[PDB]
């Protein structure tokens, strides 16, 4: 799970892939409910944290409601929230393992967005709030000539009626 993602939904987390009914150490025997998607952290969005979590499976439970159409390239469907999933199977699912890494954007991300996700890649930039200025005054007593520049919008001259 990527924890932080789901461009549209803030409180969400995509599932890169979920193997189910994993019998014992061996993992090739798990039911591939979701195929493996490559990491796709958007450019300029910081460090996305991805985690690998393992649950203790008491009894074989068919996760039909959780199975995903393989191959799934309709990213929208990857929407997922652990709490609901765990609550469903909390009786037979208890976590026992963790492993998480954080990754930035990279050229492979552009490949993922285009080749298989088949959409234009989003670009994000860190934007700060505009600086605070006290309310403009008709007479800026004792203030330097820079005062008028603080409250202007356009850096080019205008001529109005002329």
């Amino acid at each position: 799970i990527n924890l932080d993602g789901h461009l549209l939904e803030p409180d969400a987390e995509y599932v890169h892939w979920l193997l189910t009914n994993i019998p014992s150490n061996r993992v090739a025997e798990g039911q591939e409910t979701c195929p493996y998607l490559p990491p796709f952290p958007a450019r300029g969005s910081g460090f996305h944290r991805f985690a690998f979590l393992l649950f203790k499976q008491d009894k074989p439970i068919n996760f039909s409601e959780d199975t995903r159409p393989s191959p799934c390239y309709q990213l929208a469907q990857r929407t997922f929230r652990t709490f609901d999933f765990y609550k469903r199977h909390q009786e037979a699912m208890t976590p026992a393992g963790l492993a998480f890494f954080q990754c930035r954007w990279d050229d492979s991300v552009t490949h993922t967005f285009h080749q298989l996700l088949d959409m234009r890649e989003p670009v994000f930039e860190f934007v700060r709030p505009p600086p605070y200025h006290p309310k403009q005054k008709r007479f800026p007593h004792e203030q330097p000539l820079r005062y008028l520049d603080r409250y202007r919008d356009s850096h080019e001259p205008t001529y109005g009626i002329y």
Binding site: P10, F47, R120
Partner: peptide, 22 residues
């Protein structure tokens, strides 16, 4: 495309995000 839908404002929740950015 439903895939293309993107929220205008991102909400990166990673606590160490801004610190790592510096």
């Amino acid at each position: 495309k439903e895939n293309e839908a993107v929220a205008p404002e991102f909400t990166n929740r990673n606590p160490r995000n801004l610190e790592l950015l510096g």
